[PDB]
């Protein structure tokens with residue numbers, strides 16, 4: 001059996017997929033895997049798909065620029081892999097679900113919101129705000145827990161010639177908004193946004209999420225941010241953190257390996273912290289950032305791909321992924337963490353800090369509309385002065401209500 005496997009090359013690198021594929025072929029001598037890894041995995045497989053040649057299994061989460069996963073989800077072109085949760089992990093005698101940590105099978109994995117899983121969870125990386133711990137301590141600053149403190153810090157930093165905030169690409173606001181929305185309104189309000197409850201963007205809580213972000217990207221943003229907020233130059237904005245020209249950026253644990261070969265200010269130490277909330281004593285949420293592994297409905301070897309998918313939750317697979325910081329969402333995989341990951345996961349141990357996860361529902365779609373463009377990509381426009389706060393809200397409410405109608 002020959003499996004065609006396409007995987008996204010992100011901050012964790014592609015060598016881990018080469019080694020994992022090699023390790024599966026050593027365990028399972030009857031399976032050969034043709035692995036394709038690429039930073040542009042959409043452009044690789046989409047021509048073959050529209051020509052009839054589909055890969056058997058794809059590693060690509062929600063949130064890409066092309067939105068390939070969401071598109072195939074809209075065309076009902078992604079195989080139901082709920083039975084993968086019950087499969088025996090190759091090399092072991094445990095089921096996939098026996099090994100999964102809590103709070104990783106949800107709206108992201110069940111984009112139609114039922115009991116059917118279509119995107120199996122990949123990785124397990126906390127997202128929040130990444131900064132230089134040493135730079136903050138050198139200036140006598142403490143990590144803000146509220147946005148009032150965050151903007152007062154922005155003023156203090158601005159007086160020293162340091163921008164408060166930057167971001168790699170606008171897409172990185174999926175984790176940011178997941179935290180900020182849940183911080184302000186709570187869990188039910190969060191699910192309501194993700195599932196397009198009518199007029200949810202007209203609520204005071206959704207307006208406050210937009211006002212806070214509007215103030216951030218229009219008054220406390222590194223001036224070079226939007227010009228570099230693309231797939232080719234996103235690391236430039238990330239470098240401004242290592243250079244000390246920007247304090248904070250929304251990011252996840254892949255940043256450590258992704259910026260492994262980069263210069264940085266003397267004494268640089270990674271800092272990690274939840275996005276601040278708006279109210280004293282409010283819960284702060286860290287985003288469980290996962291990507292997805294999935295099988296197209298047109299795949300020709302679904303059964304062999306499912307068995308290989310189960311192997312991605314094995315101890316062997318987890319130890320290979322872990323070398324670059326990619327922590328598979330299996331139990332105990334945060335025990336015995338590498339030192340460079342401790343600052344990130346230790347944020348879960350802070351008082352009144354919990355987890356948030358999920359993405360937008362795929363149960364409805366409207367031609368010409370894209371809620372992820374209206375919420376995430378619209379930051380670039382808002383930061384550029386092309387979109388007012390009222391225009392931002394009106395667009396989100398219109399798109400969300402339209403999606404509600406379907």
Ligand SMILES: CC(=O)N[C@@H]1[C@@H](O[C@@H]2O[C@H](CO)[C@H](O)[C@H](O)[C@H]2O[C@@H]2O[C@@H](C)[C@@H](O)[C@@H](O)[C@@H]2O)[C@H](O)[C@@H](CO)O[C@@H]1O
Nearest residue numbers: 010011012063064065066169171172174175230231234254
């Ligand atoms: C620029 C890039 O590819 N970065 C990836 C990173 O993808 C981003 O992950 C964050 C998580 O908050 C957001 O989902 C963001 O939208 C992602 O960026 C998109 O992904 C790719 C496909 C690209 O088209 C971008 O233009 C999009 O903005 C990965 O999470 C990370 C780990 O694999 O590696 C890279 O850094």
